[PDB]
């Protein structure tokens with residue numbers, strides 16, 4: 001049956017890809033690989049360049065509408081950033097997807113200044129999660145300072161000249177105590193996190209009545225089947241453990257003393273008991289709120305793009 | 310502090326009507342007076358013509374974008390209506406606002422076909438409300454078949470060739486037995502109802518995960534102080550009562566049989582015990598989710614307009 005999404009067929013996707021010259025210079029190819037050494041350049045050419053080009057159509061149409069309204073309404077021409085959000089399971093590739101889209105979108109002269117903010121920064125710090133008995137519930141709704149996350153995007157959509165977000169580090173598994181990131185009226189702000197499509201219903205312990213989505217222009221849910229997500233999560237955990245072999249400041253220091261087999265069992269249980277329950281209860285149900293659903297397969301290659309009609 | 314809204318006072322909003330020349334036609338005037346005899350044409354020319362022109366800019370921007378996307382999407386796809394929703398208290402003037410905008414938006418050659426659907430039709434019938442003890446809660450979240458309403462707008466946004474809504478009559482105070490209304494791909498659909506800005510959080514008894522708002526391009530919340538809403542509610546009730554003098558099939562015949570004074574007492578209790586409580590608990594908290602908040606003062610005169618930046 002018909003749904004609110006069109007699924008791109010290969011001729012529509014190819015025409016999008018081929019609509020512009022947008023293959024990259026050598027230096028740009030180098031910086032892309034620096035985002036993630038496992039990123040395929042074939043994916044960049046077949047998937048991420050066209051997806052960034054698709055977004056440009058939306059962003060550009062919005063700038064023109066803004067010019068038309070400022071003339072009509074007689075307003076002072078104030079800059080409002082276009083906000084793109086990126087949702088999905090832990091370990092689906094939200095960060096990589098977001099960093100790739102930041103780099104590619106910045107190539108278009110109409111919107112060169114692209115910022116990226118993760119919702120991880122808005123987690124309550126470990127001290128606080130401890131106080132509340134939620135250290136096993138990191139990434140669940142009760143673990144976020146949701147009111148502050150909404151205020152951040154709300155302030156941006158208010159035309160504030162600067163806004164400040166707290167910052168989180170996966171390497172030390174916590175919010176950086178004085179590591180705040182200040183942004184100033186970018187053309188585009190990408191908001192990356194598992195909870196960007198969540199709403200007041202997900203926070204009954206402390207309700208809010210205006211949602212992140214109410215301040216977001218375009219949202220992407222990055223989707224993938226459970227088994228792939230689990231293996232991606234375990235592999236990434238093993239990578240951090242490896243890092244910890246030589247870096248004493250890694251939070252994975254003690255995991256690097258275990259056998260690999262035991263480390264795998266731990267990661268497996270973290271996935272099963274925390275991130276997978278979080279997916280099923282809180283993340284996956286938000287999926288049909290997205291502007292666009294990008295589905296991933298083997299080796300992270302995107303096999304389906306659905307866009308709201 | 311700056312907010313997410315451009316704020317216009319009446320002087321500033323009315324000043325828009327010259328910014329782009331516009332005057333009502335002769336046929337339009339007759340249509341308008343047939344919509345509401347108490348509706349001022351000056352109020353139409355000063356407030357609603359500029360509002361309609363605002364909306365045309367949004368709608369036209371969308372149509373232009375759609376044309377551009379069609380370059381790679383192709384033209385085979387189904388026509389999707391632009392959906393405008395109208396929220397606010399019982400008796401604020403949603404229906405009047407909707408019907409006026411339907412009349413005025415028909416002007417433009419870009420979008421001549423304009424349908425109007427009220428969420429009233431998606432109320433559970435009185436028999437069902439009686440089963441569930443909800444008869445004193447008509448208009449509260451539990452009194453709606455919300456799943457059916459989300460599906461209706463979802464279907465429209467899926468490109469169905471036709472979609473069908475149930476219809477309600479204030480005259481018989483119930484859903485009409487076999488009175489369903491079918492719409493066929495209009496250019497604009499106006500959805501009018503107190504609950505159009507509500508979400509799953511408002512339906513904890515039977516939650517939904519994609520909201521009405523997720524299928525709405527542009528939302529208006531019509532706002533006014535409680536004391537005016539009360540007066541407008543009571544006056545309307547007395548007008549329904551008069552209509553029932555010569556109409557014993559009106560549910561208001563029950564009140565036509567009573568003295569005016571006692572009828573006013575009843576109407577006032579219904580306001581205070583049902584609609585005012587609904588406003589405070591369920592309607593007003595959704596106001597900040599609107600694209601535009603239009604505020605009214607004495608005699609329905611608009612004194613402030615707020616539009617999302």
Ligand SMILES: Nc1ncnc2c1ncn2[C@@H]1O[C@H](COP(=O)(O)OP(=O)(O)O)[C@@H](O)[C@H]1O
Nearest residue numbers: 038039040090091092093094095096232236300
């Ligand atoms: N497009 C991709 N190509 C190859 N590997 C990827 C891709 N996206 C993500 N990954 C890998 O999958 C894992 C999860 O990605 P990450 O961006 O950290 O997910 P998230 O931010 O959603 O938690 C990481 O190990 C990352 O290197």
Ligand SMILES: Nc1ncnc2c1ncn2[C@@H]1O[C@H](COP(=O)(O)OP(=O)(O)O)[C@@H](O)[C@H]1O
Nearest residue numbers: 347348398399400401402403404405541545609
């Ligand atoms: N713009 C207006 N000018 C004059 N009277 C109005 C206006 N809007 C609404 N009314 C009156 O106020 C009452 C409530 O309006 P209605 O459109 O029935 O409200 P709702 O649909 O919100 O319940 C009605 O008696 C209506 O005639």
Ligand SMILES: CCCCCNC(=O)CCNC(=O)[C@H](O)C(C)(C)CO
Nearest residue numbers: 090120138139173251252270274275
């Ligand atoms: C050094 C400790 C390793 C355990 C990591 N915990 C988990 O994967 C379970 C909690 N989830 C997370 O830590 C997720 O990465 C987060 C909620 C921050 C979303 O990006």
Ligand SMILES: CCCCCNC(=O)CCNC(=O)[C@H](O)C(C)(C)CO
Nearest residue numbers: 399429447448482560561579583584
């Ligand atoms: C006895 C016949 C008139 C009773 C009117 N009821 C009320 O005003 C309370 C219930 N609310 C309503 O009937 C509202 O009009 C509705 C919820 C349908 C929103 O358009």
